[PDB]
Design a protein around this motif. Structure first.
Motif, short mmCIF file in Angstrom:
data_model
loop_
_atom_site.label_atom_id
_atom_site.label_comp_id
_atom_site.label_asym_id
_atom_site.label_seq_id
_atom_site.Cartn_x
_atom_site.Cartn_y
_atom_site.Cartn_z
N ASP A 102 11.78 -11.09 -9.09
CA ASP A 102 10.83 -11.13 -10.20
C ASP A 102 9.97 -12.37 -10.21
OD1 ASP A 102 11.72 -8.66 -11.30
OD2 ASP A 102 12.95 -9.63 -12.74
N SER A 103 10.53 -13.48 -9.78
CA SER A 103 9.83 -14.74 -9.78
C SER A 103 8.60 -14.80 -8.87
CB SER A 103 10.84 -15.81 -9.39
OG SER A 103 11.30 -15.62 -8.06
N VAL A 104 8.49 -13.87 -7.92
CA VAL A 104 7.36 -13.84 -6.99
C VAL A 104 6.59 -12.50 -7.01
CG1 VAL A 104 8.44 -15.55 -5.53
CG2 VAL A 104 8.79 -13.13 -5.10
N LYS A 105 6.87 -11.61 -7.96
CA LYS A 105 6.18 -10.32 -7.90
C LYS A 105 4.70 -10.45 -8.13
CE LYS A 105 10.08 -7.39 -9.09
NZ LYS A 105 10.77 -6.60 -10.14
N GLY A 106 3.94 -9.82 -7.25
CA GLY A 106 2.49 -9.81 -7.32
C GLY A 106 1.90 -11.05 -6.70
N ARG A 107 2.75 -11.94 -6.24
CA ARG A 107 2.33 -13.19 -5.67
C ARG A 107 2.58 -13.17 -4.18
NH1 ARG A 107 1.48 -17.33 -8.98
NH2 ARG A 107 2.66 -16.11 -10.52
N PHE A 108 3.75 -12.67 -3.78
CA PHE A 108 4.07 -12.63 -2.36
C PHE A 108 3.93 -11.22 -1.81
CE2 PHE A 108 7.37 -16.35 -2.20
CZ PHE A 108 6.49 -17.18 -2.79
N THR A 109 3.52 -11.13 -0.55
CA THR A 109 3.47 -9.85 0.16
C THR A 109 4.33 -9.93 1.41
OG1 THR A 109 1.29 -9.23 -0.67
CG2 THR A 109 2.06 -8.13 1.31
N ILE A 110 5.19 -8.95 1.63
CA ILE A 110 6.03 -9.03 2.81
C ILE A 110 5.63 -7.90 3.72
CG2 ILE A 110 7.91 -7.68 1.85
CD1 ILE A 110 9.79 -9.59 3.38
N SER A 111 5.52 -8.20 4.99
CA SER A 111 5.11 -7.20 5.97
C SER A 111 5.73 -7.48 7.31
CB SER A 111 3.61 -7.18 6.11
OG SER A 111 3.14 -8.36 6.70
N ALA A 112 5.61 -6.54 8.23
CA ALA A 112 6.14 -6.78 9.55
C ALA A 112 5.35 -6.04 10.59
CB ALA A 112 7.59 -6.36 9.62
N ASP A 113 5.38 -6.57 11.80
CA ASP A 113 4.72 -5.95 12.92
C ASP A 113 5.68 -5.92 14.08
OD1 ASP A 113 3.21 -5.16 15.11
OD2 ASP A 113 1.52 -6.39 14.59
N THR A 114 6.23 -4.74 14.30
CA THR A 114 7.28 -4.56 15.26
C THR A 114 6.78 -4.63 16.69
OG1 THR A 114 7.07 -2.15 15.04
CG2 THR A 114 8.63 -3.30 13.56
N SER A 115 5.46 -4.59 16.90
CA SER A 115 4.95 -4.65 18.26
C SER A 115 5.08 -6.05 18.84
CB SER A 115 3.50 -4.21 18.34
OG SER A 115 2.65 -5.16 17.77
#
Lengths: 120, 382, 212, 225
Positions: free
Chosen positions: D62-75
């Motif tokens: 909750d402390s970071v919602k809308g602030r952080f984005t998490i993603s990944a690139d498996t390539s």
């Protein structure tokens, strides 16, 4: 509020043992640390041992490590100090005190009167 | 006396054919890797050994005035007597303890339920007991202080050196294993009920939180997941069999479905999370009959275990308690200042303990279920 | 929302001693509690998972168990390598992960009160328009301490900082220092700046002071 | 070999952003769930974010919602955490951790592998060299005993300041305290050495203060007045 009472002590031979006892009167002390201090003639205010509230252990001064044990009984609202294998230099008045700081900083408000122990 | 001969004649006539068949059945159970076959085989052997000497006694009471066989014959009959008296107690205790281990700790003590282990235990029990009661054979002073050599009975008066040994023999040879059997029984009921203390809480958690989801979602699903995971742990408290493999699988499916519903609840889709939660009904409904059939095969197994533990308690209490009570009273009546009633009752009661040799073989109808098989065999013979 | 509470936030134990750390879940958690060992400057290492089993490579000294919502970590005999911060962690779901606050195992020692020193501000910082008074507590054996700053016997609050060292590698003791922050305008007033130090090992507070 | 390697930390101003990376070796990013765990200085661990690239599922504390984005690139077998609109409260060491998928042991074993962690420090403070002050002992203090002499290294920024005494010659009796962050956004250290009273005279003591980030070296003599 609390007037600690103390008992035990008296004269013991070298190598012998005594068990001192401290009791609270006017308040429950299960939330506070209880410490023993020793006032030898001349060498005043030496820390001897402390018993923390529960599972928090107990700590000893170098001079009494092994030789002395401090323990508590919350149901009785008392503190005990075992004095085992005493030497003549352990002759002193032993004081029980309440550490009022529940975070264990050593704030001593209640000092007892002191029980005299003579070895030899 | 009349009564002793009548009881002994009955015990020989019933116990010998019965113990021979019981021993054969125990062997068959061992060949099937049933760990209780070893203890039953040892009991049957100890019994056949005891019974084969009893006819000489009976003959003494029926036709003779004194022990024409000589002092040498009292040492072996007595020893054999005491053996039969104890070995059967030690093995009934071992059986009750084995069953408690089989119920309370199915996996942590699996290494102790192998046939090889039961055999090693039997060997230790036999060597230890036989040694403990072997002294009167090494030395005679005792055997003479305790017995009147002219008749194989113990002196009406008793001296010390044995006055206390009889207390040892009642406290260790009876009260100790009996208390262990009673404690084992209690432990079985407590573990079983406590097995009725974990799953019902999990089933209610799953069923009620599902009711909440349908009316209300993340909180209900969070609780359901924890309950589902503990339900798997319960599956694993039992040894492997295809139904446990299937229940673990069913739970992995159920947990995965709870997770999909959580994903939707986390996105914030209430309607979709609820539709997903409804699939938990489809899943549980696929395992209801399997669970119900599985429990029936459990309640009956537990019924048999409880009946066996209770039967062992009743056997020890009826066959041996009268002697240990009269023996303790008889010793107690001497640690200081009616006397004749204690003797008369004690000697009559000493014949009573021979009934262990008849009750024992009955245990075969409880241990396995081949009792029905044997009944069918008898019907066929007919 | 599934909070975990560790009771012994600081535990003192000897080498070879028996250590038990207790953690309580706020709600039912299946045996999904892990214990981690963190040493300063390092990422946490997993010791125990599923409230029981050891992670491969973890010494047999470690064990733990669940009783309802109460979880424990036991070190059967502390080795010199086990003085670390242990964390209790709840893993029911990827998004619900919570940690307890951590419990630190300290090396047990006998009790001794610290030596106390006062370091007055001097011209090299006073000329900058600021002032600071530093109170030093050396070689304290227990961890707990309270230091009060008083000026002309008034008790101050909110205008001081504190820093404590790690247990010394040879003595297993702590040193503490605190700084009273004053603007020059505040330093130019008052006569006595005092540090009152109270410890469990002292029968009475020890004071040292600076008379301007 | 199983590795998680973080990178991309550093100093960012409030309201700014950083992109942290977590490279994987041995295992692929798609083979497990990645988690970021934060540890503020002096604090316990906080879970921050989750990604499962195998399902496209993410979540945040909750402390970071809308602030952080998490993603990944498996390539590239690499995961990322995009930290936007950072606040002072987000200063922490960020660790990347590996937790597998349900069913079975990969799930029950939780954060089996942690990366090394990377520090994110959020501050409006500019780079500053120290102000170094002599915490000289008074000759009247604890007279006849061991004097405490030290140096106060004040108002510096960033964090990694090294203090040594007598150019590395004095290591016995030396306590360097962890720096305290001041309300100014700058840090302050205190370094104290214990010395026999008599040694006051002689054995001049020098506080050698080294700040690599500001190319600054300060040598101060601590002496009683």
């Amino acid at each position: 509020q609390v007037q600690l009472q103390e008992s035990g002590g008296g004269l013991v031979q070298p190598g012998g043992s005594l068990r001192l006892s401290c009791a609270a009167s006017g308040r429950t002390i299960s939330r506070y640390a209880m410490s023993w201090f020793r006032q030898a003639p001349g060498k005043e205010r030496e820390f001897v041992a402390v018993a923390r509230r529960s599972g928090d252990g107990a700590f000893y001064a170098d001079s009494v490590q092994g030789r002395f044990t401090v323990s508590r009984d919350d149901a009785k609202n008392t503190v005990y100090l075992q004095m085992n294998s005493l030497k003549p230099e352990d002759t002193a008045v032993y004081y029980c005190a309440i550490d009022s700081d529940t975070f264990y900083s050593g704030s001593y408000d209640y000092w007892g009167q002191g029980t005299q122990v003579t070895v030899s | 006396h009349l009564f002793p001969p009548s009881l002994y004649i009955f015990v020989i006539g019933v116990g010998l054919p019965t113990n021979c068949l019981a021993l054969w059945a125990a062997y068959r159970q061992v060949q099937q890797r049933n760990e209780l076959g070893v203890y039953l085989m040892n009991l049957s052997i100890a019994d056949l050994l005891y019974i084969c000497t009893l006819p000489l006694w009976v003959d003494y009471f029926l036709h003779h005035d004194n022990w024409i066989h000589g002092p040498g014959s009292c040492k072996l009959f007595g020893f054999i007597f005491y053996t039969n008296i104890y070995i059967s107690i030690a093995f009934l205790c071992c059986i009750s303890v084995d069953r408690y281990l089989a119920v309370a700790h199915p996996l942590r003590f699996a290494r102790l339920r192998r046939v090889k282990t039961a055999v090693a235990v039997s060997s230790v029990v036999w060597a230890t007991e036989l040694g403990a009661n072997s002294a009167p054979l090494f030395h005679d002073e005792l055997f003479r202080d305790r017995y009147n050599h002219t008749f194989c009975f113990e002196k009406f008066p008793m001296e010390g050196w044995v006055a206390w040994m009889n207390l040892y023999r009642v406290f260790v040879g009876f009260l100790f294993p009996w208390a262990l059997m009673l404690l084992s029984y209690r432990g079985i009921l407590r573990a079983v009920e406590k097995r009725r203390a974990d799953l019902e809480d999990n089933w209610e958690t799953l069923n009620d939180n599902l009711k909440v989801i349908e009316k209300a979602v993340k909180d209900a699903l969070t609780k359901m997941r924890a309950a589902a995971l503990d339900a798997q742990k319960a599956t694993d408290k039992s040894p492997d069999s295809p139904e446990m493999k299937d229940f673990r699988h069913g739970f992995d499916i159920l947990v995965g479905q709870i997770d999909d519903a959580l994903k939707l609840a986390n996105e914030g889709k209430v309607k979709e999370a609820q539709a997903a939660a409804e699939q938990l009904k489809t899943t549980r409904n696929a395992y209801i009959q399997k669970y119900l059939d599985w429990e029936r095969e459990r309640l009956k197994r537990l019924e048999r275990i409880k009946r066996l533990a209770l039967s062992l308690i009743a056997i020890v209490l009826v066959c041996f308690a009268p002697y240990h009570v009269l023996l303790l009273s008889r010793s107690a009546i001497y640690l200081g200042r009616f006397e004749e009633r204690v003797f008369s009752a004690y000697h009559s009661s000493l014949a009573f303990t021979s009934l262990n040799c008849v009750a024992d073989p009955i245990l075969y109808c409880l241990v396995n279920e081949g009792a029905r098989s044997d009944v069918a065999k008898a019907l066929h013979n007919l | 929302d599934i909070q975990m509470t560790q009771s012994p936030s600081s535990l003192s134990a000897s080498v070879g001693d028996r250590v038990t750390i207790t953690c309580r879940a706020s709600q039912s958690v299946s045996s999904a509690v892990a214990w981690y060992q963190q040493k300063p400057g390092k990422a946490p290492k997993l010791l125990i998972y599923s409230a029981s089993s050891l992670y491969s490579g973890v010494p047999s000294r470690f064990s733990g168990s669940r009783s309802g919502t109460d979880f424990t970590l036991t070190i059967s005999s502390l080795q010199p390598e086990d003085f670390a911060t242990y964390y209790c962690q709840q893993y029911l779901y990827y998004s619900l992960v919570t940690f307890g606050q951590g419990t630190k195992v300290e090396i047990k020692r006998t009790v001794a009160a610290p030596s106390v020193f006062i370091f007055p501000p001097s011209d090299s910082q006073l000329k900058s328009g600021t002032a600071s008074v530093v109170c030093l507590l050396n070689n304290f054996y227990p961890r707990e301490a309270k230091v009060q700053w008083k000026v002309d016997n008034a008790l101050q609050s909110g205008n001081s900082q504190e820093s404590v060292t790690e247990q010394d590698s040879k003595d297993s003791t702590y040193s503490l220092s605190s700084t009273l922050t004053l603007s020059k305008a505040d330093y130019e007033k008052h006569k006595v700046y005092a540090c009152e130090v109270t410890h469990q090992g002292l029968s009475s507070p020890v004071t040292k002071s600076f008379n301007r | 070999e199983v590795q998680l390697v973080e990178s991309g930390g550093g100093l960012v101003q409030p309201g700014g952003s950083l992109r942290l990376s977590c490279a994987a070796s041995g295992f692929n990013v798609v083979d497990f769930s990645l988690h970021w765990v934060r540890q503020a200085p002096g604090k316990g661990l906080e879970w921050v974010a989750y990604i499962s690239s195998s399902s496209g599922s993410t979540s945040y504390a909750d402390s970071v919602k809308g602030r952080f984005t998490i993603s990944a690139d498996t390539s590239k077998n690499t995961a990322y955490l995009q930290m936007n609109s950072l606040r002072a409260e987000d200063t922490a060491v960020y660790y990347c951790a590996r937790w597998g998928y349900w069913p079975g042991e990969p799930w029950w074993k939780a954060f089996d592998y942690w990366g090394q962690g990377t520090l994110v420090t959020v501050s409006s403070a500019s780079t500053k060299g120290p102000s170094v002050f002599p915490l000289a002992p008074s000759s009247k203090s604890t007279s006849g005993g061991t004097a405490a002499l030290g140096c106060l290294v004040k108002d510096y920024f960033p964090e990694p300041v090294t203090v040594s005494w007598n150019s590395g010659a004095l290591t016995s009796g030396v306590h360097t305290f962890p720096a305290v962050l001041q309300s100014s956004g700058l840090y302050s250290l205190s370094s104290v050495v214990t010395v026999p009273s008599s040694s006051l005279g002689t054995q001049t003591y020098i506080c050698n203060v080294n700040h690599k980030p500001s190319n600054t070296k300060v040598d101060k003599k601590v002496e009683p007045k």
